[PDB]
Structures are given as structure tokens and as C-alpha cells.
Amino acid sequence: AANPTNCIAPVNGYFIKTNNTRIVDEWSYTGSSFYAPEPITSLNTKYVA
Amino acid sequence: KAQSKRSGFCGQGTHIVSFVVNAPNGLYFMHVGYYPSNHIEVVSAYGLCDAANPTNCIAPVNGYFIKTNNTRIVDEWSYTGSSFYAPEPITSLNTKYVA
Amino acid sequence: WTAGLSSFAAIPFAQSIFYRLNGVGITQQVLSENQKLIANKFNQALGAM
């Protein structure tokens, strides 16, 4: 709802609970840190989908 | 594997998609390439200086066509930059502009 | 920076050399200003060739 939105920049992706992805092969390498401004919102709002 | 970060060979100028075709006694390569087909001259604005400590400078494209905030460098439209398009680097000394 | 096509057109040759030097090496535009007769040294290198 706020202007920053979940986005895919590196491996990213993931599902519920915002970002739950690891750039490294080992799982949970990153807790969910990243944030950053979102440039635009795509169609099918509430989701970049 | 990757259209981006590739030396020109897949297609003249921009290359969008790459495909593999089985030629007789060999391998045939089919590639999708983008050619502008038209050129229109517009004045760029190499970045801008703002009261915010990080100035807005357009890293991806040379400059902004109008109002020091424009993004019509592509096929169509006259969309104005909202500053999301231009990344904000550390300010560099220049005359009322990132230059 | 010709990332895609020739849409970027042209930029001043002297300025382009300074920007490319800044990207290639830690030498910076402020350091280049501190350096004296950098262009003359480049001319000497062309003369040596």
C-alpha cells in the first residue's frame, strides 16, 4: 500500500512474508534485508504480477 | 545464455532474443535484433542540480530532453522523468547541473 | 556510454577521455585537475609511437 513495493532485483522473487530468498546456494543466506525505493507499480495491483 | 553484456555479433545494433536451429551438417543461429529505422534530434540535459544533497544524474541515458526531466529516448511517448529513472550519485561540482 | 544502439549520439572527445579514465582507473577528474599537462604527456606518448 505504501509507495515502496516488493521487487525482483538479484535472485529476489520469493512468495509470502516479502523476500525469503538466498543469493548463495545455501538456503536463508539473507534474512530479508534490502528495502530500497520502487520505481513503478505494474498491472494487477497489490502484486507486480 | 544472455542477450545483455554481449559484444555485437548476434545482430546489428541491439539484440533481443536468441534461438537455435538445426542446419543440415551443422548448427544454424537465428537471432531477434532491434533497428531504430528513424532518428529524431532532441537536446539532452546531462543531469541536474537540486537542493537535496544527492543530485539527480541520468546514468542510463546521456540526458533529459525537456524541463531537465524527460524519458522519451525510446520508440514513442513524451513521459517526464519522476527521478526514479535517474539514480542519485554523490553531488559533483558543476554549473547548476550534474554535467 | 553506448549501452544500447547509437541513440547516445556524440559527447566531447576530451570529456569522454576523462570519464573513461575515471572508470578505468582510480585517477579521478579532481586528481586529473591536480595533475599538470596530462594532455601534453598524452601528446608525448603519441609522439613516441
For chain A, count helices (H), then strands (E): 0, 0
What's chain A's Rg over C-alpha atoms? 11
| Beta carbons of A12 and B58 less than 8 angstroms apart | no
Alpha carbons B78 and B68: distance in angstroms, whole number:
13
Residue B15, strand partner residues: B33
* Residues B45, B74, C17: CA angle, nearest 5 degrees: 45
Residue type, B62: N
Per the rule left: phi > 0, alpha: psi between -120 and 50, beta: everything else, A35 is: left
What is the Cα–Cα distance from B64 to B83, expressed in whole angstroms? 11
Can you say whether the dihedral through the CA atoms of C38, C41, C42, C43 is positive or negative?
Answer: positive
Instruction: State the structure-solving technique.
Output: cryo-EM
Distance CA B60, CA B79 (A): 16
Phi, psi (degrees; rounded to nearest 5) at B29: -105, 130
Resolution (A): 4.0
Distance (Å) of CA B29 to CA B12, C37, C44: 14, 51, 47
The reply to whether B6 touches chain C by the CB within 8 Å rule is no
Q: Which among C1, C5, C8 has the least Cβ separation from residue B14?
A: C5
A near B: at least 3 beta-carbon pairs less than 8 Å apart: yes
What is the rounded CA–CA span in Å between residue B57 and residue B65? 13
- Extract long-range pairs of B6-15: CB within 8 Å, 24+ residues apart: B13/C4, B13/C5, B13/C6, B14/C4, B14/C5
Question: Residue C38 CA to chain centroid, in angstroms?
Answer: 10
Indicate the residue of C3, C5, C6 with minimum beta-carbon distance to B60. Answer: C3
